[PDB]
Amino acid sequence: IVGGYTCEENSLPYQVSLNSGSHFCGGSLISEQWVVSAAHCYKTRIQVRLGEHNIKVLEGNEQFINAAKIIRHPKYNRDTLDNDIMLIKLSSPAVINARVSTISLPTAPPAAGTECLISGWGNTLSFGADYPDELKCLDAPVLTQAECKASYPGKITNSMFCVGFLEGGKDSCQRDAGGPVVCNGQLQGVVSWGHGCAWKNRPGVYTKVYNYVDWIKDTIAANS
Amino acid sequence: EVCSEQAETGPCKAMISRWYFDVTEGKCAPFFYGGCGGNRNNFDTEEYCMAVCGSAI
Ligand SMILES: [Ca+2]
Secondary structure, three states, X not given: OEOOEEOOOOOOOOEEEEEOOOEEEEEEEEEOOEEEEOHHHOOOOOEEEEOOOEOOOOOOOXXXXXXEEEEEOOXXXXXXXXXXXXXXXXXXXXXXXXXXXXXXXXXXXOOOOOEEEEEEOOOOOOOOOOOOOEOEEEEEEEOOHHHHHHHXXXXXXXXXXXXXXXXXXXXOOOOOOOOEEEEOOEEEEEEEEOOOOOOOXXXXXXXXXXXXXXXXXXXXXXXX | OHHHOOOOOOOEOOOEEEEEEEOOOOEEEEEEEXXXXXXXXXXXXXXXXXXXXXXXX
C-alpha cells in the first residue's frame, strides 16, 4: 500500500496472507473454509495465514492452514487479465473468533464516490522497494467507469473497476494482489493490476467481486 | 535480444522471485516479478538464467 497508514492490530480479521516460500499475495476470508484471491496469484501449493498483523513476528493469534484446493476462474485470461479471481479452499476450517473473521460478499456492485478500505503488506513506494512487516490500510473512493476507461484505453474489461486517486500518491502495490477492497461492510474488489503504483492518472485496477457471487456460491457447494 | 531486456515486474501486483541477466554485472541477478506481463529476461532459477544468457557456459 502506497500512501496509506498502519492498521490497528485487531481491525481487519478477514485479511489473509498467502505464503509459498514467503508472503507473496493477500486474500479475503469469506467463510470458515474459503478464501478469495486473484487468479494471477496462482500457485500449485499455498499456505494460508490468518490473524496476521506483523507477518515477520509470531504473535500468538495466527492460524496456519494449507490450501486443499486452489481454483482459478475458468475464464481467466493471462494476456488481458479478464476474470482475475481465484478461490482457495482451506484444508481445515479456520476458527472464527475476534481476530479471524469473515467479510460479507457484495449484494450490489460498487458505486462511484464510495470510500473503500484497501489493505495489505504491499510495497509502500512508487519508485524503489520498502515492504512493511505490519499490515497497511488505505481509504480510497470508487472511480467512475469513464475515469477508469480513460485511464486505461483499450484495457478495462467488464470484470474490472478502479479505486483511488487520479493525482497519484495513494494506491496498492506489489504483494497487495489478491487482497480486499471493502466498502460499507462488503468485499467489492480484489487487488489485481495497474500501470506502476500510485502514478498520476493510473489508479489501481480491481476485480469486481459482485460479478462472481454466483460462481463463488456454486463453486463452494461443488466442493463441499 | 531477450538477454538484454530490462527486468520488468509487469502490471500485476504479486511478489514472485525470479532471475534476469544484468548486462552491467555480466551475470544473473534476482528480481521480483509481478505475476504477469513483462518480458522473457525472466527465469525461474539462477542456473537456468546463466545457462541461457551470457558468458561461455
Ligand atoms: Ca504474525
